[PDB]
Amino acid sequence: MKPSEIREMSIEEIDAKIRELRLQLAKERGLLTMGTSLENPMVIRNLRRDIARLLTIKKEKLREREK
């Protein structure tokens, strides 16, 4: 997920996306120990960095709105 599309969406659905991504991160972390048939080992890293991106642009939007 890229910042150009992140900036299109508002803060509310940014929060919703963060929630969903955290759910998925927990589920994938569980599956990691459950089974070894992991097609994509990098999913956890990609999800973590996507969540970090969402939080960063969320705070940027907050600063813009406050200013």
């Binding site: 963060i18 929630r19 955290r22 759910l23 927990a26 589920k27 569980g30 120990t33 459950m34």
Partner: protein
């Protein structure tokens, strides 16, 4: 603590699997800085279920584990299948 920032990962061990089917109980590895009230709120709000009891401990490896008992009206097996634990 934010309801979506308490759970780290489900437990998929033989003991956890047996408890899921026998005692209507889920097992999570959660943030060490989370209290029983936080764990209860997180589970209830995330999974749209009612939880009866929470028992927490700290493993010898420094992690925090939580056994959560669901009310009889809710089946832990359904939530386990939802999460893919099976």
């Amino acid at each position: 603590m934010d309801p979506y920032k308490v759970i780290i990962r489900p437990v998929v061990t033989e003991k956890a699997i047996s408890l899921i089917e026998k005692e209507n109980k889920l097992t999570f590895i959660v943030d060490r800085r989370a209290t029983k009230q936080d764990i209860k709120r997180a589970v209830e709000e995330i999974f749209n279920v009612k939880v009866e009891k929470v028992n927490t401990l700290i493993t010898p490896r420094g992690e925090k584990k939580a056994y959560v008992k669901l009310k009889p009206e809710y089946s832990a097996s359904e939530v386990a299948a939802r999460l893919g634990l099976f």
